[PDB]
Amino acid sequence: CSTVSPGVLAGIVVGDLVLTVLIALAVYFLGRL
């Protein structure tokens, strides 16, 4: 029944926040205010 254990999926969303913040942070730093 869906295995009710989406561990990997949860791993991807975590990576999602890290993705947006990683590239967004990169441009932010380069922009320098």
Next chain:
Amino acid sequence: CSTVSPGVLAGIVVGDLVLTVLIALAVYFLGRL
């Protein structure tokens, strides 16, 4: 078994790809300084 519903999770991975190409397209096109 339970509700859980790992559907939204799948939706997030899709969003992950969107983030990669979105920011990547932004910086590649013309990273504002």
